Amino acid sequence: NLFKLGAENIFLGRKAATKEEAIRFAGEQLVKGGYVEPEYVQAMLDREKLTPTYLGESIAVPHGTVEAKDRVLKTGVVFCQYPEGVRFGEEEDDIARLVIGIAARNNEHIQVITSLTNALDDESVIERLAHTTSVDEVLELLAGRK
Amino acid sequence: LFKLGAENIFLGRKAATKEEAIRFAGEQLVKGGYVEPEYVQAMLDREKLTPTYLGESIAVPHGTVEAKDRVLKTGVVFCQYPEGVRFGEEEDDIARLVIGIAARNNEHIQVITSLTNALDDESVIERLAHTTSVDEVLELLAGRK
């Protein structure tokens, strides 16, 4: 697969009042897993200010600005579940329950987004992912990705 | 959700830069009745936010959510660059197929999924990158879902 997924980068049952909080958490986990340098966290926050990374269907995919390309050490993701949701889009009902922090090498974030959206094209699967308490079930459900 | 005919197929194009290719794609989405002229700038702006090189010789420049009301009808422009256009950060990050997308809100996601699944076969990309036939393009992309 394009990126690894396991208990080390799956975070369930999180809560956040704001998307800045969820983004920072995702960024911190990308730093901790060796995917990016610490400067990438602010790059994710800066990128969000330019335009929201909500993708519709309760999913948001925060990632770094193009200027932060060299802060990415290796491609990876952090899957973060917010069962109560976090507003990510422009409007108040633009809520994300799945916040997947993305770091692809060479600014190729769209390739990781595309893998994820190709795999997460079922309403019912997204619903199960937003509430499951099992890391193994997350792994099963995202097993078809590129 | 996208129609394909000779009008939105552009074979044998050349461009020195990805910005030129994106502008050409945007201009043809304007000409084809898919989008208003402000969408061209939205495509260039999207490219500065999240580059649209998918790998395997494909790029899918699209607009922003902010420019959704500048979309008049959903659709694509299939632009072939047989000599390639660099869309990624490194030398070999070349696109021979630049598919500009007119989609509102986050509807580009489903368009990209459709294209991604229609272009899984490497031989299909190769034939599309170099064919001189509209008929063959239409046939090669008829399996899109």
For this experimental structure, what is the resolution in angstroms? 1.8
Closest CA to A122 of A59, A75, A42: A59
For residue B87, what is the domain's CATH number? 3.40.930.10
Other C-beta atoms closer than 10 Å to the C-beta of A81 total 19
Question: In chain B, how many H helices and how many E strands?
Answer: 5, 5
State which residue of chain A sits closest to B52, comparing Cα positions: A110
The residue to which tokens 């799945």 are assigned: A98
Q: Quick check: A117 contacting B, CB < 8 Å?
A: yes
Tokens of A111: 């390739």
* Phi then psi dihedrals of residue A32, to 5 deg: -60, -35
Q: Please classify residue B113 by burial: count the beta carbons closer than 10 Å to its beta carbon, then call 0-12 exposed, 13-18 middle and 19+ buried.
A: middle
Q: Report the alpha-carbon distance of residue B127 to residue B137 in Å, rounded.
A: 8
- Contact of A119 with chain B, judged by CB distance below 8 Å, is answered with no
Taking CB atoms and an 8 Å limit, are A56 and B105 in contact across chains? yes
**Parent domain of B37:** 1-145
Q: Give strand ranges (E) for chain B.
A: 9-10, 53-55, 58-59, 75-86, 94-102
Pick from B48, B90, B112: CB nearest A66 = B48
- How many structural domains does chain A have? 1
Distance CA B104, CA A122 (A): 20
| DSSP state, residue B71 | B
